[PDB]
Every structure is written in structure tokens, then in C-alpha cells.
Design a protein around this ligand. Structure first.
Ligand code: TP0
Length: 170
């Protein structure tokens, strides 16, 4: 069953435990042009999830590299458990994404606009800044499911990261 993992899955405390920690933004692709535009500029990103299960929020410490600068932000994501989504209002708009999983327990994906063939996309994250060819195939196989060509994928370059020195300064 190839595209079974693109179906929404409710978020439990176990799910929240699973995503607790440091993750690295690996790659994404979208049919939505706004997200293509903003995500293009991303050279690298790592981040921390610290869920508050009682509040259905996730504390986010984000370390983004664009134009060879480090942009650091903290904020809370809201969790909508039945729907398997997480959200965050930012720069005017509410953003929502489905939390989706691959077979590799060391990776995760966020799904944007999943209900819309004109706008859908997937972003891929791993617990290392570099991914194995196995992890990357599971991600491509999820793109294949959304009929998004592999050549549309935007990648981070862990060579380009400027945030390590701030995260340690923290
Ligand atoms: C282009 N982006 C927005 C694609 C979705 C990715 C995420 C995400 C994932 C991991 C760490 C931080 C963020 C921040 C942004 C945000 C806001 C709401 C829901 C999901 C998301």
C-alpha cells in the first residue's frame, strides 16, 4: 500500500513523545507557489520541539539560515489532535500542516494543503542534517503519491548552515 502514509493520523501523547527533540529540515516540494517562494530562500534549518501535552501546544525553537545569516525564533505551535495537524499563525496568516510519518522512525514529514491537488506539498525532516538514500526514497515515494516530480524538490545544504554558533551561544 504505497500512499497509505499520506492519510491524516490523529496525534496522541505517544506521537508527541515521538517528535520531541532536535530535527533537521531536509527537503520539501509544493504545488502552492507562495510556499515555493518562501522556502526557496532557506539554506538550512534545525529546530527543537518541546510539546506541552496538557496544553496541546509545542514549543518551537527554530534556527534558520537564509542569505548566510542565522534567523532564530521561538514560538508555540498548536496541536489539533483529532485532525493530526499542527498550526502556527505567522506574519498575518494561520498555517496548518498534517503530521505524517514514514517507515523510518528517525524522520517525519509535514503535509501542507493536503486536501487540494492545486496546492499540496510535503516537507521532510530528519534527526541528522543529512539523510540516507533509504530515508530519501521514502520521501520521494510520498511525492510520487502526490504526483509531485522529484525534480521539484528544494533541498537544504548542511554546508551552508550559520546557526550552530548561536545555538551554542544559547
Ligand atoms: C513551509 N512550512 C510552513 C511547511 C510546514 C512546516 C512547519 C514546521 C515544521 C517543523 C518545524 C517548524 C515548522 C514551522 C512552520 C509550520 C507552521 C505550521 C505548521 C507546520 C509548520
Amino acid at each position: 500500500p504505497l500512499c497509505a502514509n499520506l492519510v491524516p493520523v490523529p496525534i496522541t501523547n505517544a506521537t508527541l513523545d515521538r517528535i520531541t527533540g532536535k530535527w533537521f529540515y531536509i527537503a520539501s516540494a509544493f504545488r502552492n507557489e507562495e510556499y515555493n517562494k518562501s522556502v526557496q530562500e532557506i539554506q538550512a534549518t534545525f529546530f527543537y520541539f518541546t510539546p506541552n501535552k496538557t496544553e496541546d501546544t509545542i514549543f518551537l525553537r527554530e534556527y534558520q539560515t537564509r542569505q548566510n545569516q542565522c534567523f532564530y525564533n521561538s514560538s508555540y505551535l498548536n496541536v489539533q489532535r483529532e485532525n493530526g495537524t499542527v498550526s502556527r499563525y505567522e506574519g498575518g496568516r494561520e498555517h496548518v500542516a498534517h503530521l505524517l510519518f514514514l517507515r523510518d522512525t528517525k524522520t517525519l514529514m509535514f503535509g501542507s494543503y493536503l486536501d487540494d491537488e492545486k496546492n499540496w506539498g510535503l516537507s521532510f525532516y530528519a534527526d541528522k542534517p543529512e539523510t540516507t538514500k533509504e530515508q530519501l526514497g521514502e520521501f520521494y515515494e510520498a511525492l510520487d503519491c502526490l504526483r509531485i516530480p522529484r525534480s521539484d524538490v528544494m533541498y537544504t545544504d548542511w554546508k551552508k548552515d550559520k546557526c550552530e554558533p548561536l545555538e551554542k551561544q544559547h
